[PDB]
Amino acid sequence: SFSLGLQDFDLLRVIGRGSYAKVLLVRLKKTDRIYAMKVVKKELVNDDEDIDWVQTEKHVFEQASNHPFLVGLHSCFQTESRLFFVIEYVNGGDLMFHMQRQRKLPEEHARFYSAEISLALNYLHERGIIYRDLKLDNVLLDSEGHIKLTDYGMCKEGLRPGDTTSTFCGTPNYIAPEILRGEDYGFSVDWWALGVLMFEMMAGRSPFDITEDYLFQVILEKQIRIPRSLSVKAASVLKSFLNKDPKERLGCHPQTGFADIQGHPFFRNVDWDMMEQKQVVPPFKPNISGEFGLDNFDSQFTNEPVQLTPDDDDIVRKIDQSEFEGFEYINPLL
């Protein structure tokens, strides 16, 4: 068999966790190459809806290999209890960690990161994919200071330009008003989330800081007021992304959407074509210190025992193993 397995890897360190997975730093033994490894437990895969998101995450990961600002896939494999995605390791850490250390970013830095995120999102949208979980934790910095979006498990695939979907999902701080109101929605919810993230970068706090029922109420009702020290163009771009009407929000018009972003005065100094080729030097260079650059990862993770949690045999033996037939994959472009 062509496929790799767990025994082809050395487990080095735990580097992250979210609601659905554990992420480890790993070494591919035969090549001495370092990767990240996303680990999902099969017991969490209950229904067809859970199989759906795993398969969607795999498929988006595959497509990610074609764009500079999305994390690509090296290989996929499984054991009795788990599913594994081996993906490229990005050792500058995430923007959550960056914001905790920096507190607030100059407009130029936010402009650079948001333009690269915009290009990543547009690539997904052009291909019929809504991202649906943009947040500080899901934006990674590479060694050179360019970003990559990761975590495709919330994605909706298969949407033609005017199509919509209706699943209530996302991260509450970043969830768009149209979702909270229960409307069918499109790519608009990603542009809203970018507005929130940009406000976070430039102001140093969420615009909705404050039970989640109360947060939802605030998102639906508050009109955001921009801190007076930001420039007119920075204020303008934030307000436009944070329009509560998706039909009027910047980036969301079905014909002019992404052009309206590119042409906004906030983004005037961006050469979009050079940027998408990584020919623009980043405004910040990550410090790669500690083994494998691990100092760029929160010590709450890097202090964890480097382990996959022992299985409950009674649970594992009841798992339908046929639903992941053909999960094994290796990227043929190395």
Binding site: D50, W53, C169, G170, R205, L215
Partner: peptide, 20 residues
């Protein structure tokens, strides 16, 4: 303080994805 990883309002969720 300002940003809390997995703090209030910062956890991913979905009506179609099993958590925990």
């Amino acid at each position: 303080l300002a940003f809390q990883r997995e703090g209030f309002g910062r956890q991913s969720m979905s009506e179609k994805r099993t958590k925990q």
